[PDB]
């Protein structure tokens, strides 16, 4: 998750506390996971050999 | 009272309003805090919790 | 506020909630995931 | 928001009285608002002098000039002043009047009794230039 | 009286870019009576009447734009502006009003850098 957020505390009631998010730091970058190509080819080619 | 006019600082008089059994009223109710039970909001001293 | 999927993933918010004390509410704000949060008419203004 | 437009003599000599008068326009000078004198000396930062608040008479002061300061409000006219005694050059600045917007708005026919805008100093005057000179 | 620490005094940003004003308190802003954070964050434009921009260190004011945002907890605030516009310039101060008398920051003066 490439960005810092920010949190924000606001008082539910008596000794409650409700963390919320304020802003996000910086300029906004989307989330991402990266699986090499490679090696995820092969896996799925092996999976669809045993499927076969 | 009659003899804080002749330690009554320890003792505040608060009223404050009361859920009663309809969730839809209120009833001004009245009660006496130790004032170590009580402390202000404000700084205008009319105000506690 | 961004640049320019991530642009429309996020929604200002600004509601009422109630204090430590229960006969006051305050006027609060914050940041929701548009995945959290689902319109209630169908003039866009008002979510929950 | 509400506009403050204030008024009041520009030029004092030194150990005079500084007079200066904020009115209300758009809304009610009696409420849950505290009526905020602030002065910002020529090159300084903004400093603090006083309020008065909206619904009761409670008021206070700086400390450096508690001793000095009376703020007094006036509800008939929709109007709060600020007085100053035996000014000095150090009380040349430029003095602003301000609504801080207090935490316990009271609410009418309601679930809840009170009521928290989240809001600071709001509204600002446009400012009067103050020089302390003989 | 709360000393109110401001830096840096002086903010030269070019437009486009992110700027960050940070500003501390020698003593917690969390107000004991009602648990409010009472600091607010004011723009005095050049020769005008200061202005709101956040009350109560994140709650933004009315009519700013979502660009500048305020943060910290009760001793450390952070006032962000995430793309500084020609029309920032001026100077940017932090008050608390949590306890008397209420004390204002040196003020950071936010100019255009070239």
């Known amino acids: 998750r490439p960005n810092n957020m920010t949190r924000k505390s606001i008082r539910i009631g008596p000794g409650q506390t409700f963390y919320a998010l304020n802003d996000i730091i910086g300029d906004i970058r989307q989330p991402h996971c990266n699986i090499s190509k490679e090696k995820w080819n092969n896996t799925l080619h092996r999976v669809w050999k045993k499927l076969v | 009272s009659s003899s804080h006019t002749n330690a009554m600082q320890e003792m505040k008089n608060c009223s404050f309003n009361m859920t009663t059994e309809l969730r839809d009223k209120k009833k001004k109710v009245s009660a006496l805090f130790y004032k170590l039970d009580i402390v202000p909001l404000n700084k205008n001293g009319r105000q506690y919790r | 506020s961004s640049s320019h999927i991530a642009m429309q993933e996020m929604k200002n918010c600004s509601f009422n909630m109630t204090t430590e004390l229960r006969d006051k509410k305050k006027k609060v704000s914050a940041l929701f995931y548009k995945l959290d949060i689902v319109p209630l008419n169908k003039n866009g203004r008002q979510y929950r | 928001q509400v506009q403050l437009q204030q008024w009041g003599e520009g030029l004092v000599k030194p150990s005079e009285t500084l007079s200066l008068t904020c009115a209300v326009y758009?809304?009610?000078?009696?409420?849950?608002?505290?009526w905020t004198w602030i002065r910002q000396p020529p090159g300084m930062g903004l400093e603090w002098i006083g309020y008065?608040?909206?619904?009761?008479?409670?008021?206070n002061y700086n400390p450096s000039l508690k001793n000095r300061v009376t703020i007094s409000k006036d509800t008939s006219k929709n109007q709060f002043s600020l007085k100053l005694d035996s000014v000095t050059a150090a009380d040349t600045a430029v003095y602003y009047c301000?609504?801080?917007?207090?935490?316990?708005?009271?609410?009418?026919?309601?679930?809840?009794?009170?009521?928290?805008?989240?809001?600071?100093?709001?509204?600002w005057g446009q400012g009067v230039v103050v020089t302390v000179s003989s | 009286d709360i000393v109110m620490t401001q830096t840096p005094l002086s903010l030269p940003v070019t437009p486009g870019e992110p700027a960050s004003i940070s500003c501390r308190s020698s003593?917690?802003?969390?107000?004991?009576?009602?648990?409010?954070?009472?600091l607010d964050w004011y723009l005095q434009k050049p020769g005008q009447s200061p202005q709101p921009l956040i009350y109560?260190?994140?709650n933004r004011a009315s009519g700013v734009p979502d660009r500048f945002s305020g943060s910290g907890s009760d001793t450390d605030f952070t006032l962000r502006i995430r793309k500084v516009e020609a029309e920032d310039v001026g100077v940017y101060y932090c008050?608390?009003?949590?306890?008397?008398?209420?004390?204002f920051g040196q003020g950071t003066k936010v100019e255009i850098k070239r």
């Open positions: 008050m608390q009003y949590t306890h008397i008398p209420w004390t």
């Open positions: 109560e260190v994140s």
């Open positions: 008065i608040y909206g619904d009761t008479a409670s008021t």
């Open positions: 758009g809304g009610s000078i009696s409420g849950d608002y505290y």
């Open positions: 003593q917690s802003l969390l107000d004991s009576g009602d648990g409010n954070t009472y």
């Open positions: 301000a609504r801080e917007c207090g935490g316990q708005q009271v609410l009418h026919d309601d679930d809840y009794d009170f009521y928290d805008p989240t809001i600071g100093l709001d509204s």
